[PDB]
Amino acid sequence: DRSFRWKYHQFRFLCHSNALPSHVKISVSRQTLFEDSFQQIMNMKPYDLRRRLYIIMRGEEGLDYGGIAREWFFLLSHEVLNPMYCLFEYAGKNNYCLQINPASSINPDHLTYFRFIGRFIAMALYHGKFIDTGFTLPFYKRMLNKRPTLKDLESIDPEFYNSIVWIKENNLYFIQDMEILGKVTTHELKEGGESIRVTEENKEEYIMLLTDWRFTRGVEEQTKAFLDGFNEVAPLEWLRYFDEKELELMLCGMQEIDMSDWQKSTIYRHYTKNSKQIQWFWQVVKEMDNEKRIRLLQFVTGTCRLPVGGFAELIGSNGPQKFCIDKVGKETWLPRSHTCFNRLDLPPYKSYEQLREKLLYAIEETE
């Protein structure tokens, strides 16, 4: 049970202890970037991708192979999302909740394209460089073989989350119809699922099955193919010690956070800017290392990534939704977040050295 700090050099050592000498050349034109890099890497052997990376990007003055590489990661991480590849989509407006497009099958060769990205992420992490694709946190849980919780459902599909909340909070068969490009199929949630009816005792089991299905619907093989290519280069077992939020910070890297811009673009409900709690809140957020501030930002928004322009342009489901605090819950409770709303529920805590504790615990030991 060590710190994120320890987990990096023990993981970063784990990469180096398998790094190969020499180098590997990658000749690409920024026009044919995708189709070059794809045909490049997929025709290559996996572990050659641990050698020094030389990215020959045809028509160059560049010689700082560090800059072209880091540049290449940024540019390719964006370009894989190109909708003419039919690979990804977003559940909400304004590019919210990046998820696999279940119609990738339209490309009979798509599974390889996903395998490729697995190889690519592994390269990006094995060579300790950063990207800007903007994956969901549940994505990382699947990479960690963690099951995603109901809180995750709140983040990605509010109406679907708020549906099941009703079922658990009141009192069907084990199937789920799914329209795949017109044609619809009835997925048996279990064996004989079409015949078995929902009971109060079966609901406990039943609710889980949906929670898992919502994530693993029509993306079961795209995921299985993706994970194979990543495993082919770097074992997922290497990430056994990490969690969802630690992992995202590895792939995107840490930034300094504009502490001013945060306070200047934070909106409140029930609370006001000159409340005891908030004037304490920014007290705690100041005597804080950058490591936690992102972890906090991760806790509330569901992503360490900042979109263009700062906290002002912060997006949730249903459109822009700036950083928001609310006087919610009992002060015998922890403060909890609503990442679809980019909203923090903060109880009226009667002491500074109580808020400080209660806050950090929510960030540390909850999601």
Binding site: F4, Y8, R12, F13, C15, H16, L249, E291
Partner: peptide, 16 residues
């Protein structure tokens, strides 16, 4: 060797 650990630590010190 152990120079690997003596380079992993430097990778964390730098990156984070």
């Amino acid at each position: 060797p152990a120079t690997i650990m003596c380079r992993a630590a430097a990778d964390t010190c730098t990156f984070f």
